[model samples]
Target: GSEGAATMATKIDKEACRAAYNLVRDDGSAVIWVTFRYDGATIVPGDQGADYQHFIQQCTDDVRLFAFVRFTTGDAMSKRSKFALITWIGEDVSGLQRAKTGTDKTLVKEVVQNFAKEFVISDRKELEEDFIRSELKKAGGANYDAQSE
Candidate 1:
């Protein structure tokens, strides 16, 4: 009974995801984040916005999503933006669904290239801009080693 003769295949509509990535990556665009989810046999966009808080709200127990974020960083003199890829696997997600994420993530990464940081978040409470920015900054390196005045 443990062995199944058939298993559902994972389909990723590449162009759809690629287009969404480009929109978020566009320098002139206000869109700061874009989310993707598994809908039946295929993966597709969920929602996108400039508000990071709105994205946090989408992480519920019954859901799993990947968010590509364009996080702002650096001081006034060195102001710039950074990219991050967040994998949200709710605490209550099933073992089977959770198991598939490893392989599914490989497909998703094909379009979500060039991110400075990648983190897996299970609790929405931890999905704050402050926390994310810090991680991105850490990865940015050369923080003056705390000698700045």
Candidate 2:
């Protein structure tokens, strides 16, 4: 008998995110999910009203270059805590290419550049490196030597 909100309770579909990225890169479209979690008793009751709104604004603003869905949730108690989820729809490459090469390339570039600037942090770089290493291993490049250069 506890009272709380679990706004973003849904697990993120990593496959969908990756698929969406690939699809957008390959001239297709996809739906990707973004989730936010708020836990503990520290969240103010008054702030609850604007939690979802703020979440959507931040998430979408963070990736304004991509087109996606904005879904809102309510206060619901769970075993864990409160959260929010937003799904972003990646534009088909054709759309992007058309836009980028058309009348809005500057705006698109600015938005995309801002997003990249925001998201390209140290942790992300490390994660990308790790992913590259993992892929190399999967492709049997672990033993390949490039020291000759």
Top of the candidates by TM-score: 1
| Segments in model 2 whose C-alpha atoms lie over 4 Å from true places | 1-10, 27-115, 118-149
lDDT of 1 by residue, 45-136 (tens): 77788788888888887777788888766565665666887888887988776667655887778888766655677787767867877788
Candidate 2, 118: how far from true, in Å? 4.6
Q: Give the 10-residue window scoring lowest on summed lDDT in candidate 1.
A: 1-10
Cα deviation at 139, candidate 1, in Å, is: 1.7
lDDT computed for candidate 2: 0.26
Question: lDDT for every model?
Answer: 0.75, 0.26
TM, every model: 0.79, 0.19
**Candidate 1: Cα lDDT at 37:** 82
Show pairs that collide, candidate 2: 5-76, 7-83, 8-83, 8-84, 27-93, 68-88, 68-89
Reference-based lDDT, residue 11, model 1:
72
